[PDB]
Amino acid sequence: DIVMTQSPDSLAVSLGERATINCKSSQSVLNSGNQKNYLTWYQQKPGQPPKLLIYWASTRESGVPDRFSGSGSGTDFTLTISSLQAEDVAVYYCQSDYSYPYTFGQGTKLEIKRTVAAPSVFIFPPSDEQLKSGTASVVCLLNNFYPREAKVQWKVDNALQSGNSQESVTEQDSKDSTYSLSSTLTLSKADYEKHKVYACEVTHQGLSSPVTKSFNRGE
Amino acid sequence: AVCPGTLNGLSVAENQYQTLYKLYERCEVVMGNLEIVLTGHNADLSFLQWIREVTGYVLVAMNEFSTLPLPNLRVVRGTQVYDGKFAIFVMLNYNTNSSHALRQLRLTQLTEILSGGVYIEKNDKLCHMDTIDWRDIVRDRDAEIVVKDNGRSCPPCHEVCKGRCWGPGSEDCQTLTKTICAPQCNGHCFGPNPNQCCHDECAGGCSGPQDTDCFACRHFNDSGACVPRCPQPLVYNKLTFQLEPNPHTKYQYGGVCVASCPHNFVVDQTSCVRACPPDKMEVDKNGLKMCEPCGGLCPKACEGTGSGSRFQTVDSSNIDGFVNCTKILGNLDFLITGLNGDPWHKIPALDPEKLNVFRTVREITGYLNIQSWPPHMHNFSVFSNLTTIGGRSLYNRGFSLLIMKNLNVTSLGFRSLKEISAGRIYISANRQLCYHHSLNWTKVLRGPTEERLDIKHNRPRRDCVAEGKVCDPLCSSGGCWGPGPGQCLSCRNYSRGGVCVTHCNFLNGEPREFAHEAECFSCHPECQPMEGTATCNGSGSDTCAQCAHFRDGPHCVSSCPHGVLGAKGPIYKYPDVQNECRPCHENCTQGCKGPELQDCL
């Protein structure tokens, strides 16, 4: 089976600028019989099915703007966007048009390169209504930031945490082009009442020093 | 030997196989496209083992048989290609689930694809197709070759095949034929020596240097040899001095020279065709159905009216159907309502000028019934080419001809009418009809005349004669249909194109003419008109008293033979001092001028 490798995994391009996405296949896709490269490019916005942009490496589908372009041959292929528009942000996929099993690439998200913004950090203690059920969840929110890369550490009485937290990130905002993160620390009511100091440490490029929001159990 | 092609697509269970079988067995050359679509796994494919050449494209789609054996297939011409691109199209030849899939494409003798590319895709269990050097087969360098996405778990190619095979066997190997030849050959060689090119009549490659060594003919095939043309129908005979039919004659059916066209094919000119052109008609000549020019217009048969029909009379909605009609299968009825219009059926009155459509009619099988005629039309000259009234179907009390109550008609005007095969005749109440009194109906009406004539109450014979309405002096005792020498039943002396004449253009007049059973026929053009003497004794260039231009043997000819092909080469001649055509020198190439070698070309 053929393997499709796309580079990079994520790309940040400013508006109006040019974006290139690479794709490398394990086996050749060039057909010597007609000198045609059987390579396909897709575009998928979140929540909706993929859209066909280019087939046979360089040929565009009816309706696809001129700014989208495909090049390359054999095993190395590239998808270029001369002037990235606001509607061009999505994940892009590489696909083999040669033969079985028509393997898709792992994909690559394209985001708008925005001015660096530091996240607003908030901490939320577990409600009394949840404690009655014996479950305790602590939430740390990071609001409206760029770039996406962020490190969120939970600290219970200054002890690091692992395997007990889950985080979720929203899609890039259509208005301010930022990201938001929500991390939830889940503990038992027994484990929760054993400790006092609960804090989340946030490390971001927009922050000179790691911001830590802390609170004690009760008040 | 030669079969037609199907022209369908992927469009389509038991009938489809029947249609395919009867169609391709036992043929060798497919004049069209070979399309094998939706065929079962255990279907007999031995009826395709004789196919050597396909002029169009080969389509093998969604079949369930394991192997497709075409061991005699050598050439796919590609005069018609699939999707504008492919001479060979193989796709989807495998079952929904079952092991009924095509695994082998046996084209072990496939040597040449003159035009078009190859498409072999999405055949789950088809193997060995990725090992074949298709460039060795496909002549056109710009044609697309797409062979991919087929069988994946395939057996290695046999060691004898050296990596190229149509099957896993040792006799299933592919034999490469593309060779390196010198520049002198235009890509057509069987060896590398400049004196080893293919014949000029070879479409592509060849096995040798001869007529008979081509893979495919550039034009035609004559019993093994690729020829520029099929043997001519006519050949100049040196002893009879005219064109005689060639015994070795063959006709063009596609790209093969055949002695006789298939069951439903006629011979026009030099070729076998589906149907005869509008300007020619079908006639039987020397066993074969040939097309010959009609000499005017072609015979056309139309249905009539009255007895055994949907129309009781010809009207505004009928008259247009008799265009260019020479024979009428049935009868003709002219009724009061038909001529003046039928208000009940909302049919308008008939336009008298449209009646001229019957001028081409030569025969009426049934009866002729005229009970209404336009006032300004004082005759039936519209039926001036009408020769025969069959009377196979009768009207009223057994009548085949009926002219009734036409108060404006002065003369009949049936100047070509020679036979009324059966029935009775009723001509009455035409108060101003003259000329018919002296007519001898015995010569026209077939059989015993007694009581089959009902002719009275017309214009009295006394009034006609007193008014001068009698027959032309050139008419015989038979009578006439009207005034003039062209309205006689028979002539006293001679006739010239339906008109009675005293004499033909024997001694003077243009054109000159000869006599044949009291009829005048013109002499061959190229007969020198003789002053005070007969020009010809009959029709033909050999019956002339003197030639206008030249003389070749016994015939008179406009131009001396200048390259007319005979049995063993062309034949050239020159006109001498007495304008007679003499043969040229035996060592002359193209021209003549004179008898000596120095006059050549």
Add this chain to the structure above:
Amino acid sequence: QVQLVQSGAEVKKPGASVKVSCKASGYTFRSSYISWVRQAPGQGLEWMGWIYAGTGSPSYNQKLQGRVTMTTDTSTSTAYMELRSLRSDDTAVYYCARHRDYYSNSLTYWGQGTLVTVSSASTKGPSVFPLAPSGTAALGCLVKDYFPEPVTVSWNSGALTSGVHTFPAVLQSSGLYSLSSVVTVPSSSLGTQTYICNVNHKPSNTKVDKKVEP
């Protein structure tokens, strides 16, 4: 014009089977290939197989180990795909797409997709807990432990939409989903404006409204 409408969402227990329909229109259904592609939540695209609508000749991916079978109905112009012996990993959005022509396997027309989720968990309503706030202040609701996806969250019955961030659900170890929905508002509006989140879970017919207090 050319459309491809798939069937609704499906929820199955491990070991069961799913049959997804895909009705085509706007073109001659017979002369076309229909491919099926699945996509796990947050993951990439994966080709499962194709089928020619005319005859029904298919081609499946070997990685599914003979669990996939595809059929076509010419009469209804509908494509069907079936997965046997379902697993947790077969939770994906399953797409139905058409090849553009015979010469390219590229998928030009897609369906809206159907969410097939496979889990041993039973259908459970959501437990909504308030995220109490303590210039701008943040507050929200913790929609925890529900099944299946998805769930609908709005603030103040649709009136409040500015600064609202509803995070995508996360699949917990228990097999129940959980997400948060936050909103940032001025600290001056905390004592005057009432903030209530409207949580609606359709598959279990659950409607929860919780008022967030500081």
